[PDB]
Homo-oligomer: A and B are copies of this chain.
């Protein structure tokens, strides 16, 4: 009954066969009109950007180009196959309006299918593994699609693998269809018809090597078939995270870990679509290099690309050592950074997973990084109760030369801070009467810091708040059964003060 995604390929295609033999309905690239009826037409025509600093930093003689595929409507390279599959299913008459579309996907195809369904009125149900980032979950909830999850490490053929769950859902809900991104020939055909033509028509029909990451296999197979038909000189390479078994020869695969952090690439089975015969070499990519290269891309070229692009460029910097001056290398950057905001893009998560060690984070920072906050000339002699009137603060502050003072209640609980200039400006604008209490103008937000913490911690705090209050806390005991506690402000500090201290010490 159930048809597996691991079935051997049944296509009769082989290199050199004339295009007339195709039983598939090829579509020539469509000319996007001046105004396009639906957002779905903004798929394709993506730009190719030459990398400038990664090439030199790692001894690349050749010109290195990146096919930025993450500027599509849904922000992924999985927006071509979704649209193409929907188009083919509608043209073949299988899909009627109002039907239910179930798709087992690693998120990226899910967003594309949900977008297409929302535009065209279909109901969409998405099944994706557990490890997918929560940003995809949020975007799918917003797009109105219904989500179902499956365990991280369930084997592909198990009753509760994402493919299996999708199958049983399709066999349970009435009038539903699984487009089956793994087996549907429209998947590789989408790239073979649109992506390959654009790649060859931008670089103008010549290129030495192509580097690509392999998930469902359409990305690489669809491009490679057209390239070998039209430009055989290209060396097709594939990337695959350490843990998945796509790569050949089997020796490359020998490792035990099965769960890897990079999302969207690598599988525990060989997809039906993937045509490994048109792949001339393979490399295995770990996670540390993938995330480091993603961060390096973001920070040195402005390409807001995800981790899979990091793996792609990390493999490219190795494979492309073979090339020489005048040669051209291409990388496919699948998806946008949007889906990884809480992941590697965040330093906290990187340290938590250990992909970046503390020495790597600290060794490059300026000289003053390890100085304690104690080294600053912090001082705040006076504090004002929140009930004091505006004019009282104006006179009391300008009489003593100060222009800002912490606000603390009699109990010692800090409420915020007040700046003389702000009160003066408000009075000039009439937003507060001189008799009005400071509670109306006090800044109610700030961050609390301690003496022992380094200036690096202070700088990482000031990126979130303006006023950092150096404070202290004292526990006051009575009998070991009756106790009390109190705290107090030392002196305000801001980016201005820290920068002035750095300038003074360094000069």
Contact = CB atoms under 8 A, between A and B. Distances in A.
Given A160-B419, A381-B473, A143 B302 contact: yes
Contacts of A393: 480
Given A130-B466, A383-B475, 11 more contacts: A41-B49, A75-B304, A141-B463, A142-B299, A148-B495, A158-B425, A341-B341, A374-B375, A385-B476, A385-B478, A472-B490
A54 interface: no
Interface of A: 32, 34-42, 47-50, 52, 65, 68, 71, 73-75, 115, 118-119, 130, 134-135, 137-139, 141-144, 147-155, 157-160, 165, 168-169, 172-173, 201-204, 295, 298-304, 336-338, 341, 345-347, 374-375, 380-385, 387-389, 392-393, 395-396, 399, 403, 406, 408, 410, 419-422, 424-426, 429, 431, 443, 445, 462-467, 472-480, 486, 488-490, 494-496, 499-500, 503
Nearest to A49: B36
A434 to B, nearest CB: 12
B202 A34 contact: yes
Contacts of A380: 474
A52 B38 contact: yes
Given A71-B71, A347-B141, A419-B159, A300 B118 contact: yes
A383 B464 contact: no
Given A119-B302, A381-B473, A160 B388 contact: no
B302 A341 contact: no
21 contacts: A36-B47, A39-B301, A41-B49, A74-B304, A75-B304, A119-B301, A130-B445, A138-B346, A148-B463, A149-B463, A151-B466, A154-B422, A155-B426, A157-B425, A159-B422, A172-B499, A341-B341, A374-B375, A388-B478, A388-B479, A474-B489
A39 B303 contact: yes
Contacts of A52: 37-38, 119
Contacts of A73: 302, 304
Given A34-B203, A154-B443, A422-B158, A381 B475 contact: yes
A483 to B, nearest CB: 9
Given A49-B35, A135-B341, A142-B345, A463 B299 contact: no
A143 B298 contact: yes
Given A34-B202, A142-B345, A474-B383, A443 B302 contact: no
Contacts of A403: 159
B421 A158 contact: yes
A72 to B, nearest CB: 9
A499 B169 contact: yes
B477 A158 contact: no
A33 to B, nearest CB: 9
A-B residue pairs, 4 tightest by C-beta: A159-B421, A392-B480, A158-B422, A155-B425
A381 B452 CA distance: 12
Interface centre among A387, A429, A473, A476 (most CB of B within 10 A): A476
B473 A138 contact: no
Contact of A50 (B37, B153, B467): B37
B137 A392 contact: no
Contacts of A42: 47, 49, 68, 71
Q: Of A151, A159, A345, A346, which is in contact with the most chain B CB atoms at under 10 Å from its CB?
A: A151
Contact of A155 (B429, B474, B476): B429
B173 A337 contact: no
A393 B472 CA distance: 22
A438 to B, nearest CB: 11
Contacts of A143: 298-299, 302
Nearest to A63: B35
